[PDB]
Amino acid sequence: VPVVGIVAALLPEMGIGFQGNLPWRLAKEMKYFREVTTLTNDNSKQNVVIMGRKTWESIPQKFRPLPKRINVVVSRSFDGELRKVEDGIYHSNSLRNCLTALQSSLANENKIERIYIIGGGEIYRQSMDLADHWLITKIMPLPETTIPQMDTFLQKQELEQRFYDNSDKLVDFLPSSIQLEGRLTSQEWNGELVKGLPVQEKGYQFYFTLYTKKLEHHHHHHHH
Ligand SMILES: NC(=O)C1=CN([C@@H]2O[C@H](COP(=O)(O)OP(=O)(O)OC[C@H]3O[C@@H](n4cnc5c(N)ncnc54)[C@H](OP(=O)(O)O)[C@@H]3O)[C@@H](O)[C@H]2O)C=CC1
Ligand SMILES: CCc1nc(N)nc(N)c1C#CCc1cc(OC)cc(-c2ccc3c(c2)OCO3)c1
DSSP, X not given: OXXXXXXXXXXXXXXXXXXXXXXXXXXXXXHHHHHHHHOOSSTTOEEEEEEEXXXXXXXXXXXXXXXXXXXXXXXXXSSSSSEEEETTEEEESOHHHHHHHHHSHHHHTTOEEEEEEEEOSHHHHHHTTTOSEEEEEEEEEOTTSOOOOXXXXXXXXXXXXXXXXXGGGHHHHSOTTOOOOSOOEEEEETTEEEEEEEEEETTEEEEEEEEEEOOOOOOOOOOO
């Protein structure tokens, strides 16, 4: 089961939140996030969404737990490494231990396709060492638009050490049933190269991107 971090960030600093909320409201960004985390290649499988305690608390109480997805809320105050508390809601007290629990094919019985880390920021930092892929929505304010104030940021440094821009394989990576508008485009913005599928809403133009783990040198395999 692949571990995939999914996030929406504003370039160049990659800001993700402000005072417990999203610094923007974009219908086409939500539509993408919902479909990616919901849809699967195996019709009898469901994905898992993992979030920190604070991210859970800001999701509209009408729309949580997130429908058609197994929800996992991680807080250090909780009891076990994975615990069912309500219908489709799981409580965990360790992000690392939670991942190991779902990955063991005894517990899941091969009914989980992907583990999406919907994150938080404290979770996102810990996800750099954990996630295989990253689905990053690179958002740019249009020439007239004002940059919104933000207090939570994605580690752009830790990301570009361990991951490369694999946006060429985005359509292949996303579930087959998903619908996409534009086509793969490269674009320079404030220095850096922005590559992905271009969408425009309100005063923002954003790109859906894919970041895969870089190739590892074979240093040591655990022999018995
Ligand atoms: N644009 C985007 O893509 C997204 C942005 N956001 C933004 O993120 C911001 C919130 O930031 P942040 O506070 O970092 O959000 P988090 O939900 O990541 O908050 C971290 C909390 O998760 C729990 N936690 C963290 N690490 C672990 C661990 N290893 N094991 C168990 N529990 C753990 C802790 O809960 P406790 O203290 O109870 O132990 C901690 O307080 C908001 O402003 C929001 O808008 C959120 C999601 C997506
Ligand atoms: C759509 C936001 C998003 N984009 C990307 N690219 N990756 C993500 N992981 C997310 C996310 C998320 C979790 C979240 C956080 C939140 O507060 C910060 C609110 C919601 C949310 C969930 C359902 C909603 C809604 C907002 O508006 C009404 O319906 C959902």
